[PDB]
Design an enzyme around this catalytic site. Structure first.
Site, PDB file in Angstrom:
ATOM      1  N   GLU A  51      -3.280  13.459   1.379  1.00 43.75           N
ATOM      2  CA  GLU A  51      -4.628  12.954   2.098  1.00 43.75           C
ATOM      3  C   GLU A  51      -4.951  14.214   2.864  1.00 43.75           C
ATOM      4  O   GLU A  51      -6.206  14.443   2.525  1.00 43.75           O
ATOM      5  CB  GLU A  51      -4.039  12.018   3.096  1.00 43.75           C
ATOM      6  CG  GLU A  51      -3.364  10.692   2.572  1.00 43.75           C
ATOM      7  CD  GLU A  51      -3.390   9.439   3.317  1.00 43.75           C
ATOM      8  OE1 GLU A  51      -3.076   9.702   4.460  1.00 43.75           O
ATOM      9  OE2 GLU A  51      -4.058   8.380   2.819  1.00 43.75           O
TER      10      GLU A  51
ATOM     11  N   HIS B  58       2.114   9.017   0.522  1.00 49.51           N
ATOM     12  CA  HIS B  58       1.182   8.951  -0.143  1.00 49.51           C
ATOM     13  C   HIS B  58       1.211   9.935  -1.450  1.00 49.51           C
ATOM     14  O   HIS B  58       1.648  11.006  -1.243  1.00 49.51           O
ATOM     15  CB  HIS B  58      -0.211   9.061   0.605  1.00 49.51           C
ATOM     16  CG  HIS B  58      -0.483   8.515   1.885  1.00 49.51           C
ATOM     17  ND1 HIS B  58      -1.162   7.285   1.970  1.00 49.51           N
ATOM     18  CD2 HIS B  58       0.223   8.750   3.154  1.00 49.51           C
ATOM     19  CE1 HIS B  58      -1.251   7.082   3.128  1.00 49.51           C
ATOM     20  NE2 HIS B  58      -0.272   7.925   3.952  1.00 49.51           N
TER      21      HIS B  58
ATOM     22  N   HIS C 276       0.791  -1.089   0.157  1.00 56.08           N
ATOM     23  CA  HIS C 276       0.036   0.262   0.019  1.00 56.08           C
ATOM     24  C   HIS C 276       0.897   1.262  -0.022  1.00 56.08           C
ATOM     25  O   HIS C 276       0.305   2.502  -0.185  1.00 56.08           O
ATOM     26  CB  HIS C 276      -1.225   0.159   1.137  1.00 56.08           C
ATOM     27  CG  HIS C 276      -0.452  -0.514   2.502  1.00 56.08           C
ATOM     28  ND1 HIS C 276      -0.409   0.338   3.591  1.00 56.08           N
ATOM     29  CD2 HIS C 276      -0.535  -1.606   2.800  1.00 56.08           C
ATOM     30  CE1 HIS C 276       0.208  -0.620   4.574  1.00 56.08           C
ATOM     31  NE2 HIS C 276       0.011  -1.649   4.189  1.00 56.08           N
TER      32      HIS C 276
ATOM     33  N   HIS D  66       4.499  10.942   5.867  1.00 56.50           N
ATOM     34  CA  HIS D  66       3.985  11.032   7.188  1.00 56.50           C
ATOM     35  C   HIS D  66       5.239  10.300   7.901  1.00 56.50           C
ATOM     36  O   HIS D  66       5.490   8.934   7.604  1.00 56.50           O
ATOM     37  CB  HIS D  66       2.809   9.909   7.264  1.00 56.50           C
ATOM     38  CG  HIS D  66       1.416  10.480   6.838  1.00 56.50           C
ATOM     39  ND1 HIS D  66       0.341   9.596   6.164  1.00 56.50           N
ATOM     40  CD2 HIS D  66       1.234  11.731   6.599  1.00 56.50           C
ATOM     41  CE1 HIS D  66      -0.493  10.586   5.844  1.00 56.50           C
ATOM     42  NE2 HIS D  66      -0.192  11.655   6.069  1.00 56.50           N
TER      43      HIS D  66
ATOM     44  N   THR E 140      -4.772   6.628   8.459  1.00 57.83           N
ATOM     45  CA  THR E 140      -5.607   6.936   7.191  1.00 57.83           C
ATOM     46  C   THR E 140      -5.948   5.589   6.326  1.00 57.83           C
ATOM     47  O   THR E 140      -6.380   5.695   5.161  1.00 57.83           O
ATOM     48  CB  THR E 140      -4.964   7.868   6.643  1.00 57.83           C
ATOM     49  OG1 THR E 140      -3.775   7.475   6.207  1.00 57.83           O
ATOM     50  CG2 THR E 140      -4.721   9.295   7.313  1.00 57.83           C
TER      51      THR E 140
ATOM     52  N   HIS F 296       6.521   6.965   5.584  1.00 52.71           N
ATOM     53  CA  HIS F 296       5.942   6.612   4.328  1.00 52.71           C
ATOM     54  C   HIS F 296       5.513   7.807   3.390  1.00 52.71           C
ATOM     55  O   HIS F 296       5.133   8.757   4.335  1.00 52.71           O
ATOM     56  CB  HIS F 296       5.052   5.475   4.260  1.00 52.71           C
ATOM     57  CG  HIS F 296       3.835   5.817   5.231  1.00 52.71           C
ATOM     58  ND1 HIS F 296       3.651   5.762   6.555  1.00 52.71           N
ATOM     59  CD2 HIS F 296       2.737   6.448   4.756  1.00 52.71           C
ATOM     60  CE1 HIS F 296       2.704   6.271   6.949  1.00 52.71           C
ATOM     61  NE2 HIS F 296       1.812   6.603   6.036  1.00 52.71           N
TER      62      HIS F 296
HETATM   63 ZN    ZN Z   1       0.323   7.590   5.810  1.00 46.72          ZN
END
Ligand code: ZN
Length: 257
Positions: free
Chosen positions: A103, A93, A61, A116, A195, A91
């Site tokens: 996000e 997004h 992911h 994050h 999240t 990590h």
């Molecule tokens: Zn995250």
């Protein structure tokens, strides 16, 4: 099961994870014109000089850069926080194109990506216990926009070819997360959640106002990662972001005037 595909994405998660419709879900839109300056908030204390990165993992992911959190090395303190939070992993997004990927949003603006840095409250002894507590985690969120290259990101970029698919990892020692920070540590803060599933409502969010810049070439390497495992049908790892959720009975506080 859950993911960011055509049939298992964020709008589906509530079936298996009813907390998805809970009272303190993340991310949220930050309305800059109703977030209130809170003079009681402190400057962040980011103490990463003794950070020990170990490994980078494609988990299907995102990819996590994992740290040695077996003792207080890299910690976050101050700001809205009480006590000491140890860095466990960071990590990102990101989107399929530069106009989406973050996000959190700022006055509905989406950034190209969001970093994050995840930290857990040492008063609970281990990460698994911390995620069961409303003050268990502190996540430092940093927006990315596309422009100049971020020098301190390149060592991450250049290992991605070795962890293309889910379940792959690589040694990743001596990486300094200070090279991913912007100049200013001005921030917004609010209580929220992780999240992705299981979406636990355990996070104090600290979202920096100033984005960092990364280059198109850097982002393009992120977009060559795969959600799938080795040899499986290729699904590019893109659009691994959850959209903004209802604020409900929460206030977003600003560290700055
Ligand atoms: Zn995250």
């Amino acid at each position: 099961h859950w993911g960011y595909g055509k049939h298992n994405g964020p709008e589906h998660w509530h079936k298996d994870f009813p907390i998805a419709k809970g009272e303190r879900q993340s991310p949220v839109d930050i309305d800059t014109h109703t977030a209130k300056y809170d003079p009681s908030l402190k400057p962040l204390s980011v103490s990463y000089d003794q950070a020990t990165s170990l490994r980078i993992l494609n988990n299907g992911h995102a990819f996590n850069v994992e740290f040695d959190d077996s003792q207080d090395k890299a910690v976050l303190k101050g700001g809205p926080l009480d006590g000491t939070y140890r860095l466990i992993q960071f990590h990102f997004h990101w989107g399929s194109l530069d106009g989406q990927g973050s996000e959190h949003t700022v006055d509905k603006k989406k950034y190209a990506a969001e970093l994050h840095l995840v930290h857990w409250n040492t008063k609970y002894g281990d990460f698994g216990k911390a995620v069961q507590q409303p003050d268990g985690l502190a996540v430092l969120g940093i927006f990315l926009k596309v422009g100049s290259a971020k020098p301190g990101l390149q060592k991450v970029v250049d290992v991605l070819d070795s962890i293309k698919t889910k379940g792959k990892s690589a040694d990743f020692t001596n990486f300094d997360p200070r090279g991913l920070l912007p100049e200013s540590l001005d921030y917004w803060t609010y209580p929220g959640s992780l999240t992705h599933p299981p979406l636990l409502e355990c996070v104090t969010w600290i979202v920096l106002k100033e984005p960092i810049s990364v280059s198109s070439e850097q982002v393009l390497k992120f977009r060559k990662l795969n959600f799938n495992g080795e040899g499986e049908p290729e699904e590019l790892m893109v659009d691994n972001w959850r959209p903004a959720q209802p604020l409900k009975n929460r206030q977003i506080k600003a560290s700055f005037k």
